[PDB]
Each structure stands twice: as structure tokens, then as C-alpha cells.
Amino acid sequence: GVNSVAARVTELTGREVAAVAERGHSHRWHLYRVELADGTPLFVKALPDDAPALDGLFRAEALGLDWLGRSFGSPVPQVAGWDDRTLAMEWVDERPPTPEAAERFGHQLAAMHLAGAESFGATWDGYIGPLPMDNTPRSTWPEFYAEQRILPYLRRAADRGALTPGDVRLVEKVLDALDHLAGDPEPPARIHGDLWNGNVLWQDDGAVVIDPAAHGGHREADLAMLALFGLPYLDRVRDAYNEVAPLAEGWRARIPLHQLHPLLVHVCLFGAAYRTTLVDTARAALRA
Numbered sequence: 001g002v003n004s005v006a007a008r009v010t011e012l013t014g015r016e017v018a019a020v021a022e023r024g025h026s027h028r029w030h031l032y033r034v035e036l037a038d039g040t041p042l043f044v045k046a047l048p049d050d051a052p053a054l055d056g057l058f059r060a061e062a063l064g065l066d067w068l069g070r071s072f073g074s075p076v077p078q079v080a081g082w083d084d085r086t087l088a089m090e091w092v093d094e095r096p097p098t099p100e101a102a103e104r105f106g107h108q109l110a111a112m113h114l115a116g117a118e119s120f121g122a123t124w125d126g127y128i129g130p131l132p133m134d135n136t137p138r139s140t141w142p143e144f145y146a147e148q149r150i151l152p153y154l155r156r157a158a159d160r161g162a163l164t165p166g167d168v169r170l171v172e173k174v175l176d177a178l179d180h181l182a183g184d185p186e187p188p189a190r191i192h193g194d195l196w197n198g199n200v201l202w203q204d205d206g207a208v209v210i211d212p213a214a215h216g217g218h219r220e221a222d223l224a225m226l227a228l229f230g231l232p233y234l235d236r237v238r239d240a241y242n243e244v245a246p247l248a249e250g251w252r253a254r255i256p257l258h259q260l261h262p263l264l265v266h267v268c269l270f271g272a273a274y275r276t277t278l279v280d281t282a283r284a285a286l287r288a
């Protein structure tokens with residue numbers, strides 16, 4: 001990988017780079033394993049030299065990692081350095097999932113969430129992949145979720161013709177019922193914001209969470225995302241989580257509600273594949 005990657009990392013971290021290896025791509029940026037002179041490995045995301053880039057994209061992740069990472073036994077990687085083009089962080093060597101790690105990860109996530117937030121949203125502009133994500137601070141969840149987590153992606157998907165007017169009306173029924181469906185107000189959590197299995201890197205003693213879309217959110221969101229695409233030892237993670245920060249009564253029934261945001265993002269980003277799941281989940285939320 002780039003001699004330009006190596007240069008940028010040294011500038012940002014102050015550390016000498018001994019090696020760079022390519023590790024593929026995600027959306028609009030390239031991935032690398034970068035090794036420092038003492039053997040320390042770093043995971044590095046980098047936009048190409050000269051390429052135009054989304055306003056505040058890398059910032060959202062750098063700031064989100066810093067903010068999310070201030071809990072005991074944090075599962076969040078440490079950032080070695082960043083700028084609008086480059087993000088260098090701790091390299092994780094994955095391990096197979098184990099039930100022991102799963103229990104420990106449950107505790108890690110509970111402490112992460114319960115660090116708490118002043119409001120829903122965040123002080124920096126958000127992204128979910130390459131899509132804008134509205135982090136405007138809000139004091140109440142139903143309004144935040146409807147206006148900043150559901151409606152923007154619903155309208156976008158409808159505009160692109162991935163969702164029908166009937167699909168839109170179905171999701172709008174949920175929103176109209178939201179101040180019953182929501183359950184009871186609780187404080188905003190520090191949530192990862194995109195916590196599906198591919199963003200969980202298993203370790204011997206827990207797990208590391210990567211690629212956050214971090215903000216003040218409902219903690220049920222992260223657990224619902226683990227459920228949506230599944231996770232090794234999901235029930236052990238949730239059981240251990242519930243030991244230390246028990247979810248509010250009726251959380252299982254609310255899982256579909258909390259899956260509507262990610263599902264709308266998927267329909268936006270990836271198309272029709274996820275439409276029927278969105279519809280089925282909306283129906284399920286309505287009858288929850």
C-alpha cells in the first residue's frame with residue numbers, strides 16, 4: 001500500500017512507519033494495516049490523494065470513537081491520529097467467538113451505553129456510511145427517531161423508487177403510533193449506531209466494535225441491530241448486558257421498532273433486497 005499512506009500516518013501520529021499492507025476498501029475509502037517501527041500495528045482508513053470527500057465524514061468517526069470510548073473495559077479502538085483524509089487506529093486481530101467472550105462483551109456494551117449522553121444526537125455532523133445522519137440534539141426520543149432517524153431515509157428511498165406509496169404509508173402508521181409504541185422515556189445512551197455482527201471483532205476476553213455512527217440514542221437500538229443480522233452467542237451477550245443494565249420491561253416486543261432505522265438505511269444504500277424485511281418489520285412494530 002501507499003508510500004503516501006505511510007507519510008500521512010507518520011505526520012498524524014509522530015511515529016515511524018515500517019510497513020503498509022492493503023486490506024481492501026469500504027464505500028469511498030481504502031483500508032490498510034500499517035506497522036510502526038516497534039511492531040505496533042494500526043488499522044488505517046484513507047481517502048485517495050486529491051479525491052473530493054464528504055464534509056466531516058472522517059471527523060464523525062474520529063470524534064465518535066473518542067466519545068464512545070470513555071467507559072470501563074471499553075470495546076472501542078483507540079485513535080492514533082486523524083484528519084479529514086485519514087484515520088489511524090488500533091489494529092485488532094480477530095479471534096473466533098466464544099461464550100466467555102460473549103458474556104464479557106455484554107458487560108462492555110452496558111458500560112459503554114451507560115456512560116450516557118446529554119441529549120439524543122451529537123455535537124458533530126453525522127454519517128451512516130456515506131449518507132448524512134442528522135445529529136441535531138433533541139431532548140425526547142420519539143421526535144428524534146421519527147424526524148432524524150426514520151423520515152429522511154423513508155423519503156430518500158421513496159424518491160429513488162425503492163419503496164411504494166403504500167410502503168411509505170405503512171411506515172407513517174408506525175410513526176403516528178410512536179408515542180405509544182416507544183415505551184417509557186429513559187436517558188439517552190452512548191450508542192455505537194451501526195452495531196451489526198460485521199462491526200463486532202471478537203477477542204479472547206470480549207469484543208471490539210468498529211465503524212461507529214456514534215451518537216446519543218436509545219440503547220435498545222444497538223441490541224436490536226445485533227439481533228437484526230444476528231450475532232454469535234447473541235443471547236449470552238444480552239443476558240450478561242441485562243445483568244448489569246437491565247433493559248426496560250417489554251424490550252423484546254420493541255425490537256422491530258428499533259430496526260426500522262437501519263432497515264431504511266439499507267434500502268437506501270443497497271436497494272430492493274431489504275424492502276420486504278422493512279415491510280415485515282414495520283407490520284411487526286405496529287402489532288407489537
Ligand SMILES: [Cl-]
Nearest residue numbers: 015036037038
Ligand atoms: Cl515506533
Ligand SMILES: [Cl-]
Nearest residue numbers: 233234235236
Ligand atoms: Cl448464546
